[PDB]
Amino acid sequence: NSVQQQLEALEKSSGGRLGVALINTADNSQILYRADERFAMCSTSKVMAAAAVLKQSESDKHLLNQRVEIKKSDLVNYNPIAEKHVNGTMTLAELGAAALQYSDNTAMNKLIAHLGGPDKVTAFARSLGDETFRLDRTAPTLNTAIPGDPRDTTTPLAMAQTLKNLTLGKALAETQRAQLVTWLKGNTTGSASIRAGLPKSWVVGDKTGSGDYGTTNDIAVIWPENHAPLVLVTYFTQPEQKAERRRDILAAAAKIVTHGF
Ligand SMILES: *C(=O)[C@@H](NC(=O)Cc1ccccc1)[C@@H]1N[C@@H](C(=O)O)C(C)(C)S1
């Protein structure tokens, strides 16, 4: 019962479409399941927005500190930290933190706003050699996850490759890179996703995602106790527009692929 057989059974039993991509930084080997298929990134795209700003902070020693005003008209569906700062301000850095660690949607838009639109995030991705990733809308519409809809999608492999480069590779300058990582490890929303499928003693930084069509995503970087890091992307989506999220499926995927590390 190969890993693939385990994944296939998982997908089948879930009555959904599972997308998995793990890269073992130890030997650069990987495990792939529908990893070349497009899935709606949902909030996992936030990482690209954050990295985009860190990249330009490399060239702007003042950037990250710059303050941003938070008005009640900025609030959208999910703004856990943006609200607390309505009538006050938030620095680019704080926005980055709220967007990744709490997946604050207002935060994401501010970041997109600052960058010059979704098209810019896409450009930043292209500049990072990622030719798959594409951001088309802002929060929360980027979370429609309509089957076969090209907008705001990527492939598990492409995201997996990029996450690696950003967190453990040549993408960001050391300081920025470390900052990104710090944010990912601090995420508070992935407790039941990938993290729930790994040894509790292992270090993980991740960015979850939720959307229509019961789309359930999580992308993470894992630091095993005595092994090189592992980069894992787990996307899951369903046929019925109002299907429930299945974070447990993500956990199962992680447990499955994580085995033997
Ligand atoms: C990113 O995916 C954001 N998603 C939404 O705004 C749509 C949504 C879906 C289900 C319930 C509420 C809102 C935010 N990121 C996800 C996530 O990290 O899983 C949230 C559920 C935090 S909303």
Domains and CATH numbers, the chain: 1-261 (3.40.710.10)
Q: Which residues contact 99 (CB under 8 A, 6 or more apart)?
A: 46, 49, 50, 107, 108, 111
**Which residue has its alpha carbon closest to ligand 1 atom 7?**
211
Q: Diameter of the chain by CA atoms? A: 57
The string of DSSP codes covering 87-152 is TEEEEHHHHHHHHHHS--HHHHHHHHHHHTSHHHHHHHHHHTT-SS------TTGGG---TT--TT
Ligand 1 pocket, residue 209 CB under 6 Å: yes
**Which residue has its alpha carbon closest to ligand 1 atom 17?**
209
Angle between helices 174-185 and 46-57 (to 10 degrees): 150
Select from 256, 261, 259, 247 the least CA-distant residue to 5: 256
Q: Are 6 and 20 in contact (CB under 8 A)?
A: no
**Which residue has its alpha carbon closest to ligand 1 atom 2?**
43
How far is residue 121's CA from residue 154's CA, in Å, rounded to a whole number?
Answer: 13
**Which amino acid is present at 22?**
L
Q: Are 212 and 143 in contact (CB under 8 A)?
A: yes
How far is residue 184's CA from residue 8's CA, in Å, rounded to a whole number?
Answer: 29
DSSP 12: H
**Which amino acid is present at 117?**
G
**Which amino acid is present at 166?**
L
How far is residue 155's CA from residue 151's CA, in Å, rounded to a whole number?
Answer: 12
Q: Which residues contact 191 (CB under 8 A, 6 or more apart)?
A: none
How far is residue 8's CA from residue 117's CA, in Å, rounded to a whole number?
Answer: 38
Sign of the CA dihedral running 249, 254, 257, 259:
negative
Q: Are 144 and 212 in contact (CB under 8 A)?
A: yes
Instruction: Please state the length of the chain.
Output: 261
Angle between helices 46-57 and 118-127 (to 10 degrees): 70
Select from 75, 74, 114, 69 the least CA-distant residue to 90: 69
DSSP 45: G
* Catalytic residue (one of 14, 43, 57, 193): 43
Q: Is 43 a catalytic residue?
A: yes
How far is residue 112's CA from residue 145's CA, in Å, rounded to a whole number?
Answer: 19
Cα dist from 204 to 133, 146, 187, whole Å: 23, 30, 9
Q: In the numeric block, which tokens belong to residue 236?
A: 């899951």
Q: Which residues contact 257 (CB under 8 A, 6 or more apart)?
A: 3, 7, 20, 22, 31, 232
Q: Which residues contact 52 (CB under 8 A, 6 or more apart)?
A: 111, 115, 120, 121, 124
Beta strands in the chain (DSSP E): 17-24, 29-33, 39-40, 67-70, 88-91, 153-154, 203-211, 215-223, 230-237
Q: Phi-psi bin for 224: left (phi > 0), alpha (psi -120 to 50), beta? A: beta
Sign of the CA dihedral running 246, 137, 188, 179:
positive
**Which of 39, 42, 153 for a ligand 1 pocket mutation test, highest count of atoms within 8 Å of Cβ?**
42
How far is residue 247's CA from residue 103's CA, in Å, rounded to a whole number?
Answer: 16
What helix, strand, coil percent values describe the chain, rounded to 5?
Answer: 40, 20, 40
**Backbone angles phi and psi of 248, in degrees to 5:** -55, -35
Burial of 153 (0-12, 13-18, 19+ CB in 10 A): buried
How far is residue 129's CA from residue 152's CA, in Å, rounded to a whole number?
Answer: 17
Q: After which residues is the chain broken (C to N over 2.5 A)?
A: none
How far is residue 124's CA from residue 48's CA, in Å, rounded to a whole number?
Answer: 8
N-to-C CA span, the chain = 17
Ligand 1 pocket, residue 190 CB under 6 Å: no
Residue 260 Cα to ligand 1 middle (Å): 32
